[PDB]
């Protein structure tokens, strides 16, 4: 059911990094990874948490729809794209932490905790500050647990409305061409060691869907582009994409 392919380690070694890629073939119900241990090691979700956070905010009416404008609070932050108004689509695209911190404040501790348990999301532990626990609190999730969560989202099986799930999957849209569609979310965890990057989501083909979750050591922001690059090299090697 689960197969380990250590030859994929070359895609990390060649870039002088270390990490895990996990792939799941939905048609065949078969999983593949370069490192079974790390695939089941739990890390801070960082901005990958914007997927569940979006779902919860939409289902509770904290976010009306993907068009509602979240006005910049006028505080200059060091990421230029954060210093502007956003909707759900652009806030996800630019991983706008302060917008999602306000979502979490409006969701509140109790509803956040219940919903993450309903989602079976990671260790389901929101210990810490309600507006930052996914960055430096107690919540943890593994690459295999990300895939389990994404598969439910894909099939609209999470315990929120179909509409909420459709909107979040729209907001996850990352790439689309005549060969495939990628819906995914990046993450970048720096507040707790080890610093890592995430990329989780799936590849839609004409006749199958491949779910993926990767994380990798990220000692500096210089390597963030390797999250997508390494994943796509694995997808290419496995002939999932051209």
Ligand X SMILES: CC(=O)NCCc1ccc(-c2cccc(C(=O)O)c2)cc1
For the annotated catalytic residues, the residue numbers are: 47
Tell me how far apart the alpha carbons of residues 119 and 158 are, in angstroms, rounded to a whole number.
6
Using CB under 6 A, count the residues that bind ligand X: 9
Our finding on whether 132 is near ligand X (CB under 6 A) is: no
- Of 79, 110, 118, 229, the residue at the interface with ligand X (CB under 6 A) is 79
- In the complex, minimum distance from the CB of residue 227 to ligand X, in angstroms, rounded to a whole number: 7
Does 186 contact ligand X by CB under 6 A? yes
Binding segment toward ligand X, per CB under 6 A, in 10-18, 75-83, 115-123, 230-238: 75-83
Q: Is 77 in the site for ligand X (CB under 6 A)?
A: yes
134 binds ligand X (CB under 6 A): no
| Axis-axis angle for helices 97-107, 109-119 (nearest 10) | 100
Stretch of 25-33, 65-73, 76-84, 103-111 lying at the interface with ligand X (CB under 6 A): 76-84
Structure tokens at 100: 């999602």
Taking CB atoms, the residue at the shortest distance from ligand X is 95
Distance of CA 79 to the CA centre of its chain: 20
Q: Does 193 bind ligand X (CB under 6 A)?
A: no
127 is in an annotated binding site: no
229 binds ligand X (CB under 6 A): no
Give the contact letters, 203-222, x = binds to ligand X (CB under 6 A), - = no: ------------------x-
**Are 165 and 156 a contacting pair, CB within 8 Å?**
yes
Task: Rule CB under 6 A: say whether 89 interacts with ligand X.
Answer: no
Between the two ends of the chain, the Cα-to-Cα distance in Å is 26
Q: 3-state class of 218 per DSSP?
A: coil
For 118-142, the three-class secondary structure string (H helix, E strand, C coil) is HHCCCCCCCCCCCCCHHHHCCCCEC
Q: Which residues of 149-185 are buried (b: 16+ CB within 10 A; e: fewer)?
A: bbbbbbeeebebeeebbebbbebbeeeeeeebebbbb
**Least distance to ligand X, CB of residue 77, Å:** 6
* Helix residue spans in 72-187 (DSSP H): 88-93, 97-107, 109-119, 133-136, 143-154, 162-171
**Does residue 159 belong to the site contacting ligand X (CB under 6 A)?**
no
- DSSP H or E stretch at residue 20: strand 19-25
Residue 146 near ligand X by CB under 6 A = no
Residues in the annotated binding site: 47, 50, 95, 227
Residues in the annotated binding site for a beta-lactam: 47, 50, 95, 227
Q: Which residues bind ligand X (CB under 6 A)?
A: 77-79, 94-95, 186, 188, 221, 224
């Amino acid at each position: 059911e689960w197969q380990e392919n250590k030859s994929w380690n070359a895609h990390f070694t060649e870039h002088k990094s270390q990490g895990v890629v996990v792939l799941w073939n939905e048609n065949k119900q078969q999983g593949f990874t370069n490192n079974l241990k790390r695939a089941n090691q739990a890390f801070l979700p960082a901005s990958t948490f914007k997927i569940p956070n979006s779902l919860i905010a939409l289902d509770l009416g904290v976010v009306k729809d993907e068009h509602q404008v979240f006005k910049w609070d006028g505080q200059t932050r060091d990421i230029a794209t954060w210093n502007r108004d956003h909707n759900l689509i652009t806030a996800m695209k630019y991983s706008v932490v302060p917008v999602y911190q306000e979502f979490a404040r409006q969701i509140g501790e109790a509803r956040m905790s219940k919903m993450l348990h309903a989602f079976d999301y990671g260790n389901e532990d929101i210990s810490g500050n309600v507006d930052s626990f996914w960055l430096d609190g107690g919540i943890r999730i593994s690459a295999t647990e990300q895939i389990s969560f994404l598969r439910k989202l894909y099939h609209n099986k999470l315990h929120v409305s179909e509409r909420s799930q459709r909107i979040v999957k729209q907001a996850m849209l990352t790439e689309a061409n005549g060969d495939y569609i990628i819906r995914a979310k990046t993450g970048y965890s720096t507040r707790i060691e080890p610093k890592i990057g995430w990329w989780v989501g799936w590849v839609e083909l004409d006749d199958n869907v491949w779910f993926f979750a990767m994380n990798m050591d990220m000692p500096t922001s210089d390597g963030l582009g390797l999250r997508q690059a390494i994943t796509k090299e694995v997808l290419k090697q496995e002939k999932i994409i051209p």
